[PDB]
Design a protein around this nucleic acid. Structure first.
Ligand SMILES: [Zn+2]
Ligand SMILES: [Zn+2]
Ligand SMILES: [Zn+2]
Ligand SMILES: [Zn+2]
Ligand SMILES: [Zn+2]
Ligand SMILES: [Zn+2]
Ligand SMILES: [Zn+2]
Lengths: 620, 187, 586, 201
RNA sequence: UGACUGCUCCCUAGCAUGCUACUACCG
RNA sequence: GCGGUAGUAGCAUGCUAGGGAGCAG
């Protein structure tokens, strides 16, 4: 906290990797043997050898991921398009990347029009398209890191909020695992910066044996390895016309972050009935179970949801450090005290402030999160819980204590002030008491910066529980953003669920004998997915009929909506599926002579196959 | 599947038993036929099953070892490629200015952000518009980072040569404006 | 882990584990080699050893395959499968083998621990890849033998031409002269530091090297054993006499360096190789120099076998050929750096086979075939792939330092493949013109091996002397001494005034060191001392045993001196063959 | 992919693996192409070959159609039906095929080295499309036997219209007049560079 | 040029378990 | 007379592996 304030005086060219000259068989290299953080000060590597013989495979991998050689063997660059610090240009040309439009499925559009759709004055219309971008879009989108400013925190209050958050994250287990227990899916994805010139992640997960991976992972508990992050543009459907960009982290960072965090990440995504709902599905009655869990037994229930403007471009560094420290608290037996600090330093040097490669040039990332590391959603959930806790603390500590009728709450406020500003060490009994109070009067359900809260209403009116205004104030003074209350909702009737959670609305329908909650999407999104595609994937439905089956699975609960076009969407999808099947069979029987059969294929255009996906009895 | 060790015995016993049956002998020879053929087929059963299990096991082993060999070959070639890339990028370090600024350090360590700033030979500037251009690289030589640079070439967003005589205020709206200026360190 | 087997050239994945060089063996070849020989270890992509925990068996005929690993009789699962069956080992490409019948000779090559003459007989009597494998494993075993020696513990130095140096405990004194190079590396605190390329004189330690270092503490003199790389090209390429002179350009004029050099070119321009069959000082030097300017537009390579024999390699090249046309290749030991190092484009490169800048040519010259093995021929054929080349050298010279053989001497037919290639079908070239030499060597080596194709060019005044003295031999260490040399040098310089400035052939280098300590004569090496001979030389007794005197060590020693060649009859020599003047000692 | 075999009037996706122009032959037509001569390899939308790693089978007469793939004889998972069976080869248009009465059109003129007079004899005893196949195969054989000779090059230059010329490795030289234009390319280090048009007589 | 997670549908191959069936051996 | 065992066929259930596709943060 003090280093953050003091680092704003010193010049910005004295931060980052520290390099020196080493000799390998009489030839000189330039490698990084330390780091200078704005928050953590000066860090020196522990195992550095100047004179050495011919190097091995993992040394080649480490030296090929360091930005030192790439920056030192490049040209100077002065870029006036952005205000962020610039390092070097790797080539003699600047690359401009564009985004192409979508492909039009005319047959589906004609079929939909021939059934009374897209008429004037209708309540269902297309507002999801593929937007195109011009040459200078990647740099324009990268220039949004100017909203990240150095922020000092109230340390005596953060040191209590972190205890409450750790109480929230208490029902799991974690630790370190060996290289043979790591689970990777889709090994056919990109590998990072230097490495995408020779293969995908399969090449590097096959060429490296198990003890090589173990030695590489054990190397990062005594040294710091800075890497390079590549920025890519997305090609997907959306409702707004701004460019979207994701970050591609290097393989040397992901390979070790998996071994560090995967056990805890898998343990979190396997628990039901907790605050974090990552891993729970919405089919087979999952949505109803989540909604019933979040309602708990609150006394005067209302519902509330909020929004984070520029969530990843504006999150201060201190909260990211806090999230990493909270996640790394499960290593009390497998790791020492220096190993944990060096792991934290490696994480900070790789995914918090490092060189990014936009276009064909190297830039310096000021701060924030790089969406695309191995621990994105869980860290976002920790950050969301931290913000909710500090909002509750600020709401309770800023109330006239002479007007609180209940004496228990008055004593709680007195003890809260004493534990914040008059106590130096942790007091577990009051932490447990405050955690119980929060869980009784303020219930949460969190999924990576999306949240729904069921709170006591009279307590919030009297000021003993956080409100929207408290969230606005906390965001203003701790996140450097303004949160307009036009993107937040409030629901005073519990028979209708949250107004929006994970882009889905909620309706209470009668199925069987009882009443359950079902989610339904926006009809415009489903129709836009039907009509606008990437080529070959559609514009010929017979080649892929399984797209429309999934799209009709997503659009089933629209048949219980009081509005009439909403069910017509599902019926139109069923008729299109039947038409595509008939087209395929006849269109194949005609020129060729192969005769097709309709055995157990009619199930796809009858509603009973889709009705079974929302009825509790987990058949897969 | 036809020349198994027990096949000869099984077939010979079957042929002899069926010849005895075709001889129309008493029921005792028929009972002996049935017992002998039953035990013969029973003993042929495992000899026909175990061999088929073993062949599939051997085939799986062969496939796994082949894929291991392919993985090793790929590892060797990627190692060669990485070594070549490193030794190729080594040859542009300008080993006199770099040595001159390394020796001035009190322990050999220097920040990475000041190596291109003090040892690079070429500079690239990207200019949004003309107002920014006339404040940064006006003329033929300009000063930046406490050094003197002289212009060598100017191209546009389409990578076509542009002469400085036509970068003016009147002619500004006729150029693909993300201009890139290349200069060399003077003296 | 995948390649061709040394006999069938078929694809395999099996490596024999009981052969020091780990050759690639075909599955049927693997079975034949493992059955008829106590070579019971086979390597694959994974080793063929029992993986049962706590177990240790390294056979191949004993293991059973089960599950995914390999198991033995004591741990075979119910689902087991023997690896060694059907006379064919289990490995990749098992269905695309052809086998071979040359397994007995391959077994003999593999099993031969290199003891007797038959070792080299069968080394030179086999098919091509077996020749390559035999040469590779011969150099491997000799380098292992010489690396099985101690480290020269040194902590101080007296002065120049003096040294105190100690070997290890249980290790004997290594061989003496530069034929076994002494190149060591000391340590200061953390790594190794340079010492110098040296050689020792006696046991007083004079320095016959070419540098001087601040030698004292922590010094480690060692005969550096080097890892041997595998061969690529065969020992020789079968020649075919061309009709077109492709690339070769006989100039309009005649660059008349030598007269018969025109015929030289005439028959070396068409066949894929040749050889300069040169008696000492008989055009063995500058015929290539004449070829340099008669064929100036031809890429011409020059090489030898040792860094010592570069005299004629380097002198006349700069002496008469143009300055720029020459080029120098030297690792950086101490040798002639007269031309330009670090130059890839040139038409006349002069070096040794130690290290060259990888390129191909169309003309090469290669010196010192007598002490050249098939390994050196293969490496020069691999590094340089040319159209024609000449191997300078003569069978009437010394063998390579093949200290491995002790029973039978290695004769001309056993030098290398080429050295008998020109012995059976005849030499590519045969000269008969001695540049500067009386007819003593003419008579001697023409009655012995030259078949009298060269005759008297310079007159025979019979000033050379050979006496009736015999000598007495005594062994002390791996070098011996001679009392009828300690007394005999004086007894032979008693009154004859002509051989006081003669050169001392050294069958025993320690004896030459003692002679230098007592009376004083220059030390003259035997093997790598051709062309360094002066005008006047003494052939001394120095031995009677089978160390040096059967035929081919004195064929060049008789040519060291020109007029006054004192070659006394030492032992069972070629006494009753010629006429020689004699003076009886008092 | 989908071309046309016309003598049997059959759209096809098959083609002979080892032949002149990758000619298109229907199921029965590829069959009597592969039994009247030796052409034991075919190409379809995908090539027929065992799909297990490390396996190698050029032949098609013993392959099987397995689990959305192809497997073989020496390395045999045989849960399938054979590819080549019942007078036909497996592919599309396996039902709408006719066949050929003149079995040896390809077997006669596509099986020789395309230089005898019999080629042109049969080409004139053809139909319009059959003789089109003939003419295209004559152009193909012209080029494929022209690409079997040397490449002339000038390495040291002399005065124009009187130079020196070395050629290639071991290959023969074609006829001598200006029939063959010597219009090659120049190489600086890896690329091709303006040369012009030449002729050596 | 294509990041990190979570959930769901479809097709094929293998393994394990269970149900039924057909022969044969044994008591 | 009943049970056990050994192969063979069909059917069902859950995992692992491979491929194609959909949604969400
Ligand atoms: Zn740990
Ligand atoms: Zn062996
Ligand atoms: Zn073999
Ligand atoms: Zn064992
Ligand atoms: Zn054909
Ligand atoms: Zn046909
Ligand atoms: Zn196969």
């Amino acid at each position: 906290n003090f280093n953050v304030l003091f680092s704003t005086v010193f010049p910005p060219t004295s931060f980052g990797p520290l390099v020196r000259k080493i000799f390998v068989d009489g030839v000189p290299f330039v490698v990084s043997t330390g780091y200078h953080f704005r928050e953590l000060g000066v860090v020196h590597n522990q195992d550095v050898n100047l004179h050495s013989s011919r190097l091995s495979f993992k040394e080649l991998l480490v030296y090929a991921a360091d930005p030192a050689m790439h920056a030192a063997s490049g040209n100077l660059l002065l870029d006036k398009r952005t205000t962020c610090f610039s390092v070097a240009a790797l080539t003699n040309n600047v690359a401009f990347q564009t985004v192409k439009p979508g492909n039009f499925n005319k047959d589906f559009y004609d079929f939909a029009v021939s059934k009374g759709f897209f008429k004037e004055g209708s309540s269902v219309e297309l507002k999801h398209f593929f937007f195109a971008q011009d040459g200078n879009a990647a740099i324009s989108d990268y220039d949004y890191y100017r909203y990240n400013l150095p922020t000092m925190c109230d340390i005596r209050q953060l040191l209590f909020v972190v205890e409450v958050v750790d109480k929230y994250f208490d029902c799991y287990d974690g630790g370190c695992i060996n290289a043979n227990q790591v689970i990777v899916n889709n090994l056919d994805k990109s590998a990072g910066f230097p490495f995408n010139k020779w293969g995908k992640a399969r090449l590097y997960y096959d060429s490296m044996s198990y003890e090589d991976q173990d030695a590489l992972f054990a190397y990062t508990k005594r040294n710091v390895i800075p890497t390079i992050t590549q920025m890519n543009l997305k090609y997907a459907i959306s409702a707004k016309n701004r460019a979207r960009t994701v970050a591609g982290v290097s393989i040397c960072s992901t390979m070790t972050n998996r071994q560090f965090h995967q056990k805890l990440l898998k343990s979190i995504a396997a628990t039901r009935g907790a605050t974090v709902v990552i891993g729970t599905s919405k089919f087979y009655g999952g949505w109803h179970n989540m909604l019933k869990t979040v309602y708990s037994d609150v006394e005067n229930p209302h519902l509330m949801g909020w929004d984070y403007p520029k969530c990843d471009r504006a999150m201060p560094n201190m909260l990211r450090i806090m999230a990493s420290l909270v996640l790394a608290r499960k290593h009390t037996t497998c790791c020492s005290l220096s190993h944990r600090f060096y792991r934290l330093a490696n994480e900070c040097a790789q995914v918090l402030s490092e060189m990014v490669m936009c276009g064909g040039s190297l830039y310096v990332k000021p701060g924030g999160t790089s969406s695309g590391d191995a621990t994105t959603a869980y860290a976002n959930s920790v950050f969301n819980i931290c913000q909710a806790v500090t909002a509750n603390v600020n709401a309770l500590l800023s109330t006239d204590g002479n007007k609180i009728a209940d004496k228990y709450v008055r004593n709680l406020q007195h003890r809260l002030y004493e534990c914040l500003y008059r106590n130096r060490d942790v007091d577990t009994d009051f932490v447990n008491e405050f955690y119980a109070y929060l869980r009784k009067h303020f219930s949460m359900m969190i999924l990576s910066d999306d949240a729904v809260v069921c709170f006591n209403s009279t307590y919030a009116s009297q000021g003993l529980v956080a409100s929207i205004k408290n969230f606005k104030s906390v965001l203003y003074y701790q996140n450097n953003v303004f949160m307009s209350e036009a993107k937040c909702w409030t629901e005073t009737d519990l028979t209708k669920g949250p107004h929006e959670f994970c882009s889905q609305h909620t309706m209470l329908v009668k199925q069987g004998d009882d009443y359950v909650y079902l989610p339904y999407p926006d009809p415009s999104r489903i129709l836009g997915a039907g009509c606008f595609v990437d080529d070959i994937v559609k514009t010929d439905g017979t080649l892929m009929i399984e797209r429309f089956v999934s799209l009709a699975i997503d659009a089933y609960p629209l048949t219980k909506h009081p509005n009439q076009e909403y069910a017509d969407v599902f019926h139109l999808y069923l008729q299109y599926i039947r038409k595509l099947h008939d087209e395929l069979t006849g269109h194949m029987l005609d020129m060729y002579s192969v005769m097709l059969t309709n055995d157990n294929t009619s199930r796809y255009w009858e509603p009973e196959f889709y009705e079974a996906m929302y009825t509790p009895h987990t058949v897969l | 599947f036809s020349s198994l060790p027990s096949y000869a015995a099984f077939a010979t016993a079957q042929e002899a038993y069926e010849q005895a049956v075709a001889n129309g002998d008493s029921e005792v020879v028929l009972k002996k036929l049935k017992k002998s053929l039953n035990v013969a087929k029973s003993e042929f059963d495992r000899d026909a099953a175990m061999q088929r299990k073993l062949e599939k096991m051997a085939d799986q082993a062969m496939t796994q070892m082949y894929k291991q060999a392919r993985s090793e070959d790929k590892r060797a070639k990627v190692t060669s490629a990485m070594q070549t890339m490193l030794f190729t990028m080594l040859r542009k370090l300008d080993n006199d200015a770099l040595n001159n600024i390394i020796n001035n350090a009190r322990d050999g360590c220097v920040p990475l952000n000041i190596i291109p700033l003090t040892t690079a030979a070429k500079l690239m500037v990207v200019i949004p518009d003309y107002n920014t251009y006339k404040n940064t690289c006006d003329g033929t030589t300009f000063t930046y980072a406490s050094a003197l640079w002289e212009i060598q070439q100017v191209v546009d967003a389409d990578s076509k040569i542009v002469q400085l005589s036509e970068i003016s205020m009147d002619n500004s709206p006729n150029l693909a404006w993300p201009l890139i200026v290349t200069a060399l360190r003077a003296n | 882990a995948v390649g061709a087997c040394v006999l069938c050239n078929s694809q395999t994945s099996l490596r024999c584990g009981a052969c020091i060089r780990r050759p690639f063996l075909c599955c049927k070849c693997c079975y034949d080699h493992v059955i008829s020989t106590s070579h019971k270890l086979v390597l694959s992509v994974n080793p063929y050893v029992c993986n049962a925990p706590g177990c240790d068996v390294t056979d191949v005929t004993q293991l059973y395959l089960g599950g995914m690993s390999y198991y033995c009789k004591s741990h075979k699962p119910p689902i087991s499968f023997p690896l060694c069956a059907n006379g064919q080992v289990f490995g990749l490409y098992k269905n695309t083998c052809v086998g071979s019948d040359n397994v007995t000779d391959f077994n003999a090559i593999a099993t031969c621990d290199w003891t007797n003459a038959g070792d080299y007989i069968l080394a030179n009597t086999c098919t091509e890849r077996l020749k390559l494998f035999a040469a590779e494993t011969l150099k491997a075993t000799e380098e292992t033998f010489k690396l099985s020696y101690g480290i020269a513990t040194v902590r101080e130095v007296l002065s120049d031409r003096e040294l105190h140096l100690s070997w290890e405990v249980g290790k004997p004194r290594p061989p003496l002269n530069r034929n076994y190079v002494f190149t060591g590396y000391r340590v200061t605190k953390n790594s190794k530091v340079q010492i110098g390329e040296y050689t020792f004189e006696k046991g007083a330690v004079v320095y016959r090297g070419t540098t001087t270092y601040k030698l004292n503490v922590g010094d480690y003199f060692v005969l550096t054993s080097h890892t041997v790389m595998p061969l690529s090209a065969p020992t020789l390429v079968p020649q075919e006499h061309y009709v077109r002179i492709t690339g070769l350009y006989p100039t309009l004029n005649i660059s008349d360096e030598f007269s018969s050099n025109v015929a030289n070119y005439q028959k070396v321009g068409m066949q894929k190789y040749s050889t300069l069959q040169g008696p000492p000082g008989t055009g063995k030097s500058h015929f290539a120099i004449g070829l340099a300017l008669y064929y100036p537009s031809a890429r011409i390579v020059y090489t030898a076998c040792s860094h010592a024999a570069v005299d004629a390699l380097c002198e006349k090249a700069l002496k008469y050929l143009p300055i720029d046309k020459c080029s120098r290749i030297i690792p950086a030991v101490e040798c002639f750096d007269k031309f330009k190092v670090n130059s890839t484009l040139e038409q006349y490169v002069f070096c040794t086979v130690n290290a060259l800048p990888e390129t191909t040519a169309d003309i090469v010259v290669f010196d010192e075939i007598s002490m050249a093995t098939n390994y050196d021929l293969s490496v020069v054929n691999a590094r340089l792939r040319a159209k024609h080349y000449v191997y300078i050298g003569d069978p009437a010279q010394l063998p390579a330092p093949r200290t491995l053989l002790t029973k039978g001497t290695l004769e001309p037919e056993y030098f290398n493949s080429v050295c008998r290639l020109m012995k059976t079908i005849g030499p590519d070239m045969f000269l008969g013109t001695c540049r500067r030499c009386p007819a003593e060597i003419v008579d001697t080596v023409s009655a012995l091996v030259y078949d009298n194709k060269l005759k008297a060019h310079k007159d025979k005044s019979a000033q050379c002397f050979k006496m009736f003295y015999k000598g007495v031999i005594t062994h002390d260490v791996s070098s011996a001494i001679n009392r009828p040399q300690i007394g005999v040098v004086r007894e032979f310089l008693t009154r004859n005034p002509a051989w006081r400035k003669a050169v001392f052939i050294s069958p025993y280098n320690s004896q030459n060191a003692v002679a230098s300590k007592i009376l004083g004569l220059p030390t003259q090496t035997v093997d790598s001392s051709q062309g360094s001979e002066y005008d006047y030389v003494i052939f001394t007794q120095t031995t009677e045993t089978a160390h040096s005197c059967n035929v081919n060590r004195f064929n060049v020693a008789i040519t060291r001196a020109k007029v006054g060649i004192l070659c006394i009859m030492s032992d069972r020599d070629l006494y009753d063959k010629l006429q020689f003047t004699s003076l009886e000692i008092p």
